[PDB]
Design an enzyme around this catalytic site. Structure first.
Site, PDB file in Angstrom:
ATOM      1  N   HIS A   9       0.779  -1.234  -0.061  1.00  0.00           N
ATOM      2  CA  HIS A   9      -0.090  -0.094  -0.003  1.00  0.00           C
ATOM      3  C   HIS A   9       0.763   1.369  -0.120  1.00  0.00           C
TER       4      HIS A   9
HETATM    5  S1  FES Z   1       0.606  -3.243   2.670  1.00  0.00           S
HETATM    6 FE1  FES Z   1      -1.561  -3.868   2.579  1.00  0.00          FE
HETATM    7  S2  FES Z   1      -1.905  -2.267   4.382  1.00  0.00           S
HETATM    8 FE2  FES Z   1       0.526  -2.478   4.414  1.00  0.00          FE
END
Ligand code: FES
Ligand code: HEM
Ligand code: HEM
Ligand code: HEM
Ligand code: HEM
Lengths: 122, 85, 181, 39, 383, 383, 122, 85
Positions: free
Chosen positions: C148
């Site tokens: 993310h």
């Molecule tokens: S990588 Fe999926 S939320 Fe940290």
């Protein structure tokens, strides 16, 4: 299963000849007394395997009184087996009351079936 | 089929038979459990014993004979008869 | 109608509503004994699902600590999840000295996130969709969650991204050149 | 339902009864009672 | 209508459990079926919890079993169940076949039912054997080896089928893996066969110890024979606990705890106890093809039984000679089971040959001859 | 009666396959059901042939799959069948849900069937996901890890349930072994649910593309809809062969061919395509607990659908606005599936939130509002 | 499912008001024309969900001629959907023949059911 | 239930309807399959097109705008706008 026609054929084969009759018939009564069905109120013909079209026809062609007596004897046998108790000697079915009441109707049913089979292969 | 549902179980026309019974909560449960489980069980065993005993006696006699013969064969006195077989 | 069979001997001696109450008692006792037995059996079977003795023994495994370059992030394998043992130099400690009561999903400092700056222990698993963060891509200077793009601070606090919390610190204790989990 | 809760009553009753009778029948054999001799 | 009849699912559950018009005179023997079903659940249940830890690799099968016993929390309980429960599954199945042989539950209206019965039996044996091979102890491995070697006796395909079974040139990793897969599977095929068994039972209902028609007096099942099922189930579980918790390895063989080693055959090879009778039959016939054919006949001749039974009266409860013949057959079957575990020695080879001879003679001579004789005796005595 | 009706088992086969009174106006969409069953067989059949070679140990899972691919004779074929056939199973199941949504197959007489449908769907997803975890590629392992971490969001039991799911402290050997066991099993539970689906269908029969009662004109199934099912089955198998033999990895993700490594996460985590929509919903809701609740609602709301659909007329075939709403919902579902595989980025986070919003709004606003509006419009139009 | 009584309540709520009537009714006719059911021989009331006790009673209480006409229209619709063809415009059900024949019986059934429910909770 | 077996499928009393048909062996198979599958298929597509096109157009327009914006963000000229978000 063995047909009442064949059973009666063998039985009359034996009964006609005095030696076999004398040897077997006492053994036949002894076997039927040791069978223990009479102590539960059942006549011999109550034991017959009802689940066959010939036999089903035979019962379906019984008189009213014999049909109701058979129903009551079968119910009494079921109750006695259920409660694991036997009829006292005085209430059991005596040898003379085991009268082979249903045999004639089964024999008639088998006669009809055998004639139908024979004529289908005329 | 030879057994329908409750309305028509295949029973012949049944008539004149009256079935009486009493409720539970109004019958002595285990009325004769203690006396029956002894006397009636003994009666049933007495009736059915021979049918189980005669075959059992025959089979166990055969088994005992075979077992004793096998034990005899594998001994310092059964060596010769074992060789002959 | 007719004469009924005499049940006198078969009749119970006990009260009308009392015998049914006793029947209720024993039927319910049977039901609840059966429930207790089923509970015992189901608990015993499901307990097999839990960690077997092997897995429990393998966990809480000490890590071979020792001297390492300052600021370098070592990696371990305690309890499966990666452990990002980092010997952050005094520069990282000074940077963490800046307090942050706002602009941080979970305000914290090295006071609780590490026992000593010379040996920093922090599980590398991220918060949202646990993944192994990159040890140098962090927007805040620490670890970065590539899944993310989340940025992990040098103190392990979640600076940006979908992080639900801060970088979890394992329960590992410290000792003389050793890691004592 | 009350079946779930009631099952706990019987399970706990039998469990405590057995876990109090067993360590009394076998107290001379269990570890926690023998460890003193070898310490 | 009541919800237990309007809803199709509850309608089925009712037709089979709540309102099944069972005859009023059925003994406790009729409960065995339920136990068998119960056991089918247990075998599956514990089974599904063993595969969660069992590793089918040949180099891990035995170590994986020991990991279950020693490391998994209740793994010892799950394994001892799954094993002693199989032994009890076969105890109840042999009792269910014995009941069906004593009372004429195999006769006309239920012949179809009987057939599924036999198939179930056959299938079950496979499953059990296959599952046993998964332990990969000494006796496990060498039982697999002996079985496949015997199946190598098929006239022409025998030399080719065995490698397809072994998945190689001897009992090895592929064999154990395929046995694990098929063993996980075939229990569900057996569940389907049990559903077919119950359908064939429901079409014509169950028989009676008296043999005569039950239609005159039939009882519901929910207040009656469900609470009899509970007595039978709790007795079953009580004995099953006496085995599982106390002396759980009594039914097994100690050699099965020695990891399988192809280079050393153990002193004796015996199946798990419940397959001993047929194994004995297999050894009674010298020819390997003859042995396998004779064994599978020893299992399949139950199919011939409903036609060789020329008895006009269903069941043995009211028959003098047939009861003696039945008990003699049962004790000879136990004698065959006993000879299965005993070494092929001087008296035992002949005794096993005679026992197999009488085992088959039962079905093909004694049942027809005795049934005919008793039909004639019944008719002559009543007249 | 004919043998196909007198015999119990043949009677069942007749009731469901030979004489089942299908409506005469059913499209090819009604064949999808059959395909699903066929697919359920394939997944099982091929599946059973992979457990014969698959080793569930973590250090052997991926290597065992590669052994299947390279060493077993037709192992590559069986693996490709088992994977692309799961993908096609889900294609056909999505088509079978889309049909049941377009035509009012979920309405009053068939709600129970619909409910079972949903359960099947739920169950299948688990199975499929679990099967994926068996390959233990990068994507396999990390999908398992993400699912378990999200399930750890239960308020209180979450911290305790996950170690039970793992059998340890992270996705490891116990997790893969238990996934293999449950994955082998749950397909048979799904077969049972499919039989329940078929009974719930048989009680009331199937719907029509016109929606009106079919009882006026029904046809047997053996001459009709069996040779229609053959057309659909052969089209299914033709496309299935185009995939299995040519470009078999099109539906799969390349990273799944990298053996699982807990210490290095792959650049992006995505399920197999058929689970992407729900995954997208899961990432649309920020809170982990909210995400899981919304994810499961995304399926369970199908249960709410039969009651929110206030239409007096079954089906969409004769409804203008409802058809626009249904196609908009289908395309938003495909959009959610597409967003499932895209990274969380500036436009896509908002687009996924809006897509999830409208996905639920369909069921809880659009279906009731549109259905009521169309009922009123119908009545006003005819008067 | 929306009770037909509620549908008629809403329809008269709209129809009574001249503005809502002038707006909707043209759209109502246009929507029933675009629906496409008329080209298959079906009147509106043929489409109604039959599988409900109220609707089933309403059908059971239809006159003979209406019942047979409905049967033939449903059969024709099934045949058309089966053969993937539509009736020619001259044979399609004209707007005037879409006469709402079944609604009165449905409303009577709804009235009976609602009275029974109201009195059961008196 | 709402669908019985063949004897009584639940259809209302049906009467005055005559159904004619001819044997399959006496009928031409795939008569106008060539002409039907083209003209009638085009007719069906024409009737059902708008319902699939308008929703598809809306959804694909939203998808295209989102995709184009995403592509624009991850470029040298989109750097500032990406940073602001
Ligand atoms: S990588 Fe999926 S939320 Fe940290
Ligand atoms: C009627 C059905 C079944 C019977 C009679 C049966 C019987 C047996 C028996 C006797 C064994 C030998 C185990 C030992 O000696 O230690 C065994 C092993 C095994 N069975 Fe079953 N079983 C049945 C169904 C199942 C099912 C459905 C499963 C599902 C997983 C299963 C899983 C196993 C496993 C994993 C083993 C390996 C034994 C071990 O690791 O200890 N069985 N089975
Ligand atoms: C998992 C294994 C089995 C299950 C669950 C099962 C199920 C049942 C049930 C529920 C009954 C009714 C209760 C009773 O009559 O005892 C029954 C009866 C019966 N069992 Fe089974 N069965 C199994 C295996 C077998 C096998 C292997 C055979 C024979 C080889 C067999 C032969 C029969 C017969 C013939 C009956 C009918 C008995 C009668 O009506 O008198 N069964 N079975
Ligand atoms: C292995 C998976 C499934 C199988 C084998 C199966 C089986 C069938 C069969 C044989 C039919 C009749 C043919 C047809 O109507 O197309 C049918 C229809 C149906 N399917 Fe399934 N089904 C499955 C999964 C599902 C799922 C997951 C759903 C919804 C979530 C569902 C919803 C329905 C409904 C509602 C019907 C009734 C259709 C109607 O009457 O209009 N099914 N199914
Ligand atoms: C509807 C039921 C089922 C579905 C939808 C399904 C689906 C799947 C899927 C999608 C995979 C991933 C495999 C890959 O991507 O390479 C898989 C794996 C697997 N499945 Fe199934 N499956 C089903 C039933 C079964 C059954 C009954 C078995 C019996 C053995 C089975 C055995 C396996 C095995 C062994 C794997 C490991 C994959 C491999 O080694 O390549 N599955 N399943």
């Amino acid at each position: 299963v063995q047909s009442m026609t064949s059973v009666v054929k063998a039985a009359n084969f034996i009964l006609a000849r005095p030696t076999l009759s004398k040897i077997i018939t006492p053994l036949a009564q002894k076997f039927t007394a040791y069978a223990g069905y009479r102590e539960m109120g059942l006549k011999f013909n109550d034991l017959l395997l009802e689940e066959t079209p010939i036999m089903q026809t035979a019962i379906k062609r019984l008189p009213s009184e014999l049909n109701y007596s058979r129903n009551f004897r079968i119910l009494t046998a079921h109750q006695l087996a259920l409660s694991h108790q036997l009829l006292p000697a005085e209430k059991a079915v005596k040898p003379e009351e085991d009268d082979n009441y249903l045999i004639p109707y089964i024999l008639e049913a088998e006669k009809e079936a055998f004639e139908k089979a024979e004529l289908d292969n005329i | 089929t030879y057994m329908g549902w409750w309305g028509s179980l295949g029973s012949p026309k049944q008539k004149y038979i009256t079935q009486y019974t009493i409720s539970p909560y109004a019958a002595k449960p285990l009325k004769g459990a203690a006396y029956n489980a002894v006397f009636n069980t003994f009666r049933r065993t007495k009736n059915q014993f021979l049918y189980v005993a005669i075959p059992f006696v025959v089979v166990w006699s055969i088994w005992t004979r075979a077992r004793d013969y096998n034990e005899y064969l594998y001994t310092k006195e059964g060596r010769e008869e074992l060789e002959r077989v | 109608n007719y004469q009924q069979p005499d049940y006198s001997s078969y009749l119970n001696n006990k009260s009308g509503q009392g015998s049914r109450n006793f029947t209720y008692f024993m039927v319910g006792s049977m039901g609840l004994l059966s429930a207790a037995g089923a509970k015992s059996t189901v608990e015993a079977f499901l307990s097999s699902f839990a960690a077997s003795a092997d897995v429990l023994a393998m966990a809480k495994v000490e890590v071979k600590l020792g001297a390492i370059p300052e600021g370098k992030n070592v990696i371990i394998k305690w309890q499966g999840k990666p452990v990002f043992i980092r010997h952050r130099t005094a520069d990282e400690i000074e940077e963490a000295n800046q307090v942050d009561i706002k602009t941080l999903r979970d305000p914290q400092n090295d006071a609780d996130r590490v026992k000593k700056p010379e040996w920093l222990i922090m599980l590398g698993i991220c918060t949202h969709l646990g993944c192994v963060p990159i040890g140098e891509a962090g927007d805040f200077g620490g670890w970065f969650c590539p899944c993310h793009g989340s940025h992990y601070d040098i103190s392990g606090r979640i600076r940006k991204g979908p992080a639900p919390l801060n970088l979890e610190i394992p329960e590992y204790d410290f000792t003389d050149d050793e890691t004592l989990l | 339902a009350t079946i779930f809760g009631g099952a706990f009553a019987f399970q706990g009753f039998f469990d405590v009864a057995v876990n109090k009778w067993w360590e009394e029948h076998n107290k001379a054999k269990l570890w926690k009672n023998v460890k003193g001799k070898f310490l | 209508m009541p919800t237990r009849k309007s809803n199709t699912y509850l309608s089925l559950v009712n037709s089979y459990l709540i309102d099944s018009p069972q005859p009023s005179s059925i003994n406790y023997w009729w409960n065995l079926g339920s136990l068998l079903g119960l056991c089918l659940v247990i075998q599956i249940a514990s089974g599904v919890f063993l595969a969660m830890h069992y590793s089918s690799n040949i180099e891990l099968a035995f170590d994986s079993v020991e990991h279950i016993m020693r490391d998994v929390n209740a793994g010892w309980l799950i394994r001892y169940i799954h094993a002693n429960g199989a032994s009890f599954f076969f105890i109840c199945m042999y009792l269910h076949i014995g009941k069906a042989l004593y009372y004429g539950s195999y006769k006309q209206p239920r012949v179809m039912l009987w057939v599924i019965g036999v198939v179930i039996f056959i299938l079950t044996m496979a499953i059990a054997f296959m599952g046993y091979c998964l332990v990969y102890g000494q006796m496990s491995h060498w039982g697999a080896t002996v079985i496949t070697n015997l199946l190598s006796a098929i006239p022409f395909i025998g030399n080719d089928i065995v490698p397809f079974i072994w998945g190689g040139f001897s009992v090895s990793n592929p064999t154990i893996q395929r046995f694990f897969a098929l063993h996980f599977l075939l229990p569900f095929i057996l569940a389907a066969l049990v559903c077919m068994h119950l359908m064939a039972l429901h079409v014509h209902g169950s028989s009676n110890p008296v043999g005569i028609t039950g239609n005159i007096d039939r009882l519901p099942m929910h207040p009656y024979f469900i609470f009899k099922d509970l007595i039978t189930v709790f007795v079953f579980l009580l004995i099953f606990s006496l085995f599982v918790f106390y002396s759980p390895n009594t039914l097994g063989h100690p050699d099965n705890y020695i990891p399988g080693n192809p280079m050393v055959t153990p002193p004796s090879i015996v199946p798990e106890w419940y397959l001993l009778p047929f194994y004995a039959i297999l050894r009674s016939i010298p020819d390997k093809l003859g042995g396998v054919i004779a064994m599978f006949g020893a299992i399949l001749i139950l199919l011939s039984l409903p036609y060789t039974d020329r008895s006009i009266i269903r069941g043995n409860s009211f028959k003098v000679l047939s009861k003696l013949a039945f008990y003699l057959f049962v004790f000879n079957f136990i004698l065959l089971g006993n000879l299965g575990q005993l070494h092929v020695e001087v008296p035992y080879i002949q005794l096993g040959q005679f026992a197999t001879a009488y085992y088959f003679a039962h079905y093909i001579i004694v049942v027809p001859v005795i049934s005919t004789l008793e039909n004639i005796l019944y008719y002559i005595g009543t007249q």
